[PDB]
């Protein structure tokens, strides 16, 4: 545009340009709007649809099925479709049955490979549902016990290296 080179999508703009201004910039001093030199209209410039792509998969020892998550975009700009916060998820079947989180996606959503088998999406559980009674006249006292042993593993050191510059 009259010497202002760039790429992207040109759309209608609501930027209140002054009579002597030809183009505008964002907070990083990068051009994000231009004036058309013939029509004097303002064109809003954005990048063409884009976003990170992640592949959700079980081990290839079991299957070769995948689901694809498009981050930052919903299910209308992408061209078993589920819309979550992370972005549009395609290839996974959403179910209302909750389970423990297996392959995490985000915002409470996880995926797994189950039943014949396919990739599914679900809201992850937090733990077992229970309750403790409050009372002012009753106490619970253990009548038996068990001795148990648990294992804890901690790193202490790592590989020592050296370099001849």
């Amino acid at each position: 545009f009259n010497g202002l080179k760039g790429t992207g999508v040109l759309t209608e703009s609501n930027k209140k340009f002054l009579p002597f201004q030809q183009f505008g910039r964002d907070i990083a001093d990068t051009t994000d709007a231009v004036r058309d030199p013939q029509t004097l209209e303002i064109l809003d410039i954005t990048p063409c649809s884009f976003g990170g792509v992640s592949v959700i998969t079980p081990g290839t020892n079991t299957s070769n099925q995948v689901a694809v998550l498009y981050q930052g975009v919903n299910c209308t700009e992408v061209p078993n479709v589920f819309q979550t916060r992370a972005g549009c998820l395609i290839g996974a079947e959403y179910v209302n049955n909750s389970y423990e989180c297996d392959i995490p996606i985000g915002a409470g959503i996880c995926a797994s490979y189950q039943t014949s088998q396919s990739i599914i999406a679900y809201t992850m559980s937090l733990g077992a549902e229970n309750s403790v009674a409050c009372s002012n006249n009753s106490i619970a006292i253990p009548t038996n016990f068990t001795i148990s042993v648990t294992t804890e593993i901690l790193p202490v050191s790592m590989t020592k290296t050296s370099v001849d510059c």
Partner: peptide, 24 residues
């Protein structure tokens, strides 16, 4: 030459770039 005080006058638009709600 009755020298006076310029105060805060004499500022002008340095460019033809649209900016809004920003410090430059």
């Amino acid at each position: 030459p009755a020298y006076t005080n310029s105060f805060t006058r004499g500022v002008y638009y340095p460019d033809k770039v649209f900016r809004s709600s920003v410090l430059h």
